[PDB]
Ligand binder design. Sequence first.
Ligand code: NAG
Ligand code: NAG
Ligand code: NAG
Ligand code: NAG
Ligand code: NAG
Ligand code: NAG
Ligand code: CA
Ligand code: CA
Lengths: 177, 177, 537, 536
Amino acid sequence: AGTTYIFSKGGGQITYKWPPNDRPSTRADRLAIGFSTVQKEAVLVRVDSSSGLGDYLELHIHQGKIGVKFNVGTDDIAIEESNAIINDGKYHVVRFTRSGGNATLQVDSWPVIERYPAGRQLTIFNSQATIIIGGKEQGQPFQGQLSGLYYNGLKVLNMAAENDANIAIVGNVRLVG
Amino acid sequence: AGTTYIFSKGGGQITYKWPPNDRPSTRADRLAIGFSTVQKEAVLVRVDSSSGLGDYLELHIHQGKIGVKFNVGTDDIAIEESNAIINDGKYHVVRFTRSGGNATLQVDSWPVIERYPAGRQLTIFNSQATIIIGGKEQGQPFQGQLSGLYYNGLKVLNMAAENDANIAIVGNVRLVG
Amino acid sequence: RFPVVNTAYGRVRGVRRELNNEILGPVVQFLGVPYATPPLGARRFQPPEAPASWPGVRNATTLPPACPQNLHGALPAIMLPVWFTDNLEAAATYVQNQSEDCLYLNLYVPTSGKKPVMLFLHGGSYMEGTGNMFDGSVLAAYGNVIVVTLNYRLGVLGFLSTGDQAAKGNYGLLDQIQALRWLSENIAHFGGDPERITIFGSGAGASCVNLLILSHHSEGLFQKAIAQSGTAISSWSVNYQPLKYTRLLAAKVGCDREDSTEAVECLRRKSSRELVDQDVQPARYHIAFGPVVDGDVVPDDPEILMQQGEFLNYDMLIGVNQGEGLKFVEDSAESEDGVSASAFDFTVSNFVDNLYGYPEGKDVLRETIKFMYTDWADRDNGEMRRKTLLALFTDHQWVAPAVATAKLHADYQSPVYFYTFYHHCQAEGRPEWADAAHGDELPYVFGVPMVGATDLFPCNFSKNDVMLSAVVMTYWTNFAKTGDPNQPVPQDRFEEVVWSKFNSKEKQYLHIGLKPRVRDNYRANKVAFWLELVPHL
Amino acid sequence: RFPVVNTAYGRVRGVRRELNNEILGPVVQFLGVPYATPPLGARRFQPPEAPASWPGVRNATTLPPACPQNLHGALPAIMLPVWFTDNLEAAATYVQNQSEDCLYLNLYVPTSGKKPVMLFLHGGSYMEGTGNMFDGSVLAAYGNVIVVTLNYRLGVLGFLSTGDQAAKGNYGLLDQIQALRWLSENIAHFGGDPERITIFGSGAGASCVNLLILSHHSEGLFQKAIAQSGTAISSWSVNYQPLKYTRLLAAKVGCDREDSTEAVECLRRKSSRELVDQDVQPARYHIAFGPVVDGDVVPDDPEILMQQGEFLNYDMLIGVNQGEGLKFVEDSAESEDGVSASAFDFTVSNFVDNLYGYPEGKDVLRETIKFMYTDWADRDNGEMRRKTLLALFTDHQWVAPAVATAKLHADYQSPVYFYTFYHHCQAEGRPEWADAAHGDELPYVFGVPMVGATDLFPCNFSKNDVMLSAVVMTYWTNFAKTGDPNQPVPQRFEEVVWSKFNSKEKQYLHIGLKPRVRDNYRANKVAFWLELVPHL
Ligand SMILES: *[C@@H]1O[C@H](CO)[C@@H](O)[C@H](O)[C@H]1NC(C)=O
Ligand SMILES: *[C@@H]1O[C@H](CO)[C@@H](O)[C@H](O)[C@H]1NC(C)=O
Ligand SMILES: *[C@@H]1O[C@H](CO)[C@@H](O)[C@H](O)[C@H]1NC(C)=O
Ligand SMILES: *[C@@H]1O[C@H](CO)[C@@H](O)[C@H](O)[C@H]1NC(C)=O
Ligand SMILES: *[C@@H]1O[C@H](CO)[C@@H](O)[C@H](O)[C@H]1NC(C)=O
Ligand SMILES: *[C@@H]1O[C@H](CO)[C@@H](O)[C@H](O)[C@H]1NC(C)=O
Ligand SMILES: [Ca+2]
Ligand SMILES: [Ca+2]
């Protein structure tokens, strides 16, 4: 019920760029978003490292099922909610908590999904640089509504309506009211 | 008989030193000298190289036998007039022709002793520095009479009698006349 | 006056010591503030916990007792700072009240937000050194920063480990982390800023810094780091064979049970002085008791943890002195000429035998590091063989690991500032040919020249020394304030030089000295030899 | 004025050509004097014999024919001098009348009483060249010395060998020694001195000079030597497997019998033009037909011989240039930036494969000679990779062997003077980054700048080049006169005293526009190649 942003025809994208001297590297991450769309394939939020590093975190809908795919350095680990129908046009909420190599996913009120990949896994997400909302550059444009991107205390959607210097709006992204 | 020299009690040494720029190296060495003495253990002619090089040539009377021992780089090669006695007080002329490893030693009219050592042999007498007559420093001083020390076209005794600037005398080396 | 201050565990009373110089304000000193419960009996060889609150007012005006140690023993005489092993009799004055319950810390508060904190991790090895040797009061008044100097468990009582859970080890590291936690949750009462805690140290303490970066225990406790003359990847940084030396000590003391827990309990039943005064000699260029790679405090080999980027983007200020292997060449420091060619081929061979010992690459590596570290234009100089031996030890132990850690930290986009220290105070027994040795930057960082010679530092300081001390103190305090040695306080030839970062592509550094200049590559040839060619042999 | 001088075999008629320059006096050239019987029939593949007296007066005015060769074919381009390969069209003009009767020598008598003699042993490689290209008349008129440039059997006809007694080999060296013998027994008639015969040469010819020092055939024929940019211990100075290439040539020509004597007898029947034109490609940085260790002329391999002092105290004037491997880096001389890393490591790997080829020391050696030859302070230049590749080739092939042979000669108390050449004539097609390449000290020694540009040397020569040519010619002629480049004729070049190359302190002179007597030429890399590479 926060600063809900409307995607329109064609596509759009929201970019949050950290200051070059204050790019944070976190051992644990928390990604929360409420959304409403009927797309069968989409990329909602994609978090990238700086230049060259292969560290990334992406939230995406594959075959209608929402899931988080992140690469922390060893292998690409994906935890996906597949035992439900979520792209039915209703307002859903998804919360993802990552602690080192362990991952936890929750959607609405359905029971949590835990992922514990085998072997010794790197734990540090190195030098986050940009938050990407919409997945325009990923190849799957988004057509729907998003609300409340809480990411380690940096609500990008909250500042998007405030015309912050670091926030960039490119495309047909629209804001209610 | 040439310019005869006499070695008295205690002996002495007469030295001809090549200039430091004109030290001769020679593949074939020729020696020839007349002498008269009754000694049994002595060294007469000493040819040395400059610092470091192991090349040398020795004429010595050991156990009543006159012989020549030269080191050209591989090993010491010695040839002696074993089948005769020479220290009888008479005038004996000794000549010695060298060609690399091959050596021919002749005395008076007795048959020439020939030596053709086996194996790979070095040939060059590198950087001859001084010629020594008397053999006092070696450890076997000589006491007798010498005449015409021929060494590769250098009449050493004749030029020593001529009082050259490159000839020095020490001890009891005395001229005949 | 005595400005009592209230902490989360009670109230403490300090002092208002007045400084000798006339350009430094007064400094309030709280000496002996505890930060962890005394680990005397059954709590020995256990991680520290929070202290006990006291009713009323605690009285903190005297230097706290030192940790148990055997200074007059067979110390590792190479890794220690030169001023420590020269003035060893004066250093024993501070370690006079050695007691097991040594977990205390001393705060120096000067009198544009709240003041930053600078924690100091002392040490030359892990078996010596106490925080009372350094009076961090000149640095506090000059930079308007709070300076904290602590005491932590050392040697047998603080780093003994077996490998299993009977004694995991790294008790000194957990003591330092507990001190950082106490600072994080109690410094705002003293006027400090709990979000600008810079942690710095020289020598073995510096290694602790580079091991506190990789420990997830110290996540949000500090934000910056200043590691001078020390790394976590040198040969004497960690202990990869703790069980061997633990068993050797257990057998020496009088109990060696095949069960680790039984032997650990027996050791817990023995007096500290009895198991500290024993002598266990480690292999050369190694340590007996030190940090251990277990999995809790140090997850993996430090050389592997930083290659994979397991750190949280801490601003770093690394540094190297010109010649620190001054104790490598000590048997030949009293000769008219240098070392003989027959002896230069001997120290290098012993060096390779003690550091590599590989049966395969023992004759190809020795010949190539003999060829590299000889001045071929002066092949028979003599002195320029002692000089190259000193340079060899410095390059292998202190320069190459420092540059390696700088590159690994910069490749993951964390601001790294590299410095090289050249000037040194004219000591008494120091050879004329010698230069800035190990630990010869502490006098300048701690503002010794601004108060004159002490018992620990008896050189005479000129005006140039005072200028250099002011410059390096300004650099360090600027870093602690804003994370950039030039931003807050401009210099006042040091004025016009701008210190640049350390990018891996172009390794810019600063050549601190009487004639500073931002150079571009420090000993590129030998550093490349030690990092890029030697692994191929 | 055609002066007639009577030799030990007859009378020859010369000329009295006068030079274009004013200071230099006129010379007398006996171009075309023979020194051995021509090897046409059964004398082919045989050592030379002394000539036959001719009744009357023999005209010596025309430049004699060159020895059979084929420039427009497969030649080793790496070892050839730069001016020879660049101006190959003009160079091929001199070799036009190639005949098997090519044993001739050319004297240039100028116009204390006797004059010094300087023989020139030409040849960039062992397949090409002739003495007519080097008009040694300015050198004769300036330094007042008698310059003699000869022609000797080249390539297949003068160096073919089988190892056995069917063809001993080294017919070119035997021809050169025969020419030296003719000079020794005949130069007194022309006014020269039979006691001051210097021999000098650049390129592979200089190798001959070194191979002429260790041979007992040339015992008292000459007294000095000037070996520039050449050695007898480098990779391409001696042919170590001549039987293989001889058998390949026999198979290619048309007769390859199992018996060496029958094969040689069949070869003698072939024309001199048939076997020259066939190509026989040797391995890279090696030679096919060249000097062979046989026990007659060269007793053992040259590297061993100079270790055990098997030389007769010949004064030496050795030297090198700054960059001679200019043709090592040729495919990358027409690029915006220098050699890329993927290509630098590839060239180094090919270098190690072709030159060492040791299965054991393969990746230890390649890594260390990669690390040694790269400037780490400016690692990613790109352009400072061409310089290091050129320096690597120069150091391995020309500088390290030259320093090794200078040390070996100086260790047995025989004077050695080491020189390094830096200034090079500004050509047209030579890159700006390049420097004095192989054989770029030849215009200055022979006084080309004092006559002007010729077909072989198309640069212009300014006043600086004339001054340097005068200085270098003065040094060379002083060495010929007295064995010391300072004594007879005094000269930035007046205050410099050239010092002997001592093994302990490797003193040398740095010839150039700014000369200086330096102390150690590339001590690091030379010590690398002489004292570390053998340990891997
Ligand atoms: C992941 O879960 C395992 C199992 O409980 C635990 O041991 C480990 O510490 C967890 N890792 C993180 C980074 O929380
Ligand atoms: C010694 O004599 C043999 C006999 O033929 C000869 O072959 C050899 O060359 C001679 N040695 C020298 C050094 O000439
Ligand atoms: C602080 O403590 C000492 C000894 O514990 C005591 O003598 C002194 O009076 C105290 N300071 C006060 C009470 O101000
Ligand atoms: C201080 O100067 C005095 C007198 O020159 C000298 O004796 C003393 O050793 C010096 N001390 C130091 C450490 O500079
Ligand atoms: C020499 O040349 C002249 C003309 O130059 C000619 O008349 C004469 O026949 C020639 N003689 C010989 C022997 O070649
Ligand atoms: C030689 O040619 C170059 C071409 O640039 C020119 O600079 C120079 O002046 C010329 N020298 C003479 C003497 O013509
Ligand atoms: Ca990572
Ligand atoms: Ca010898």
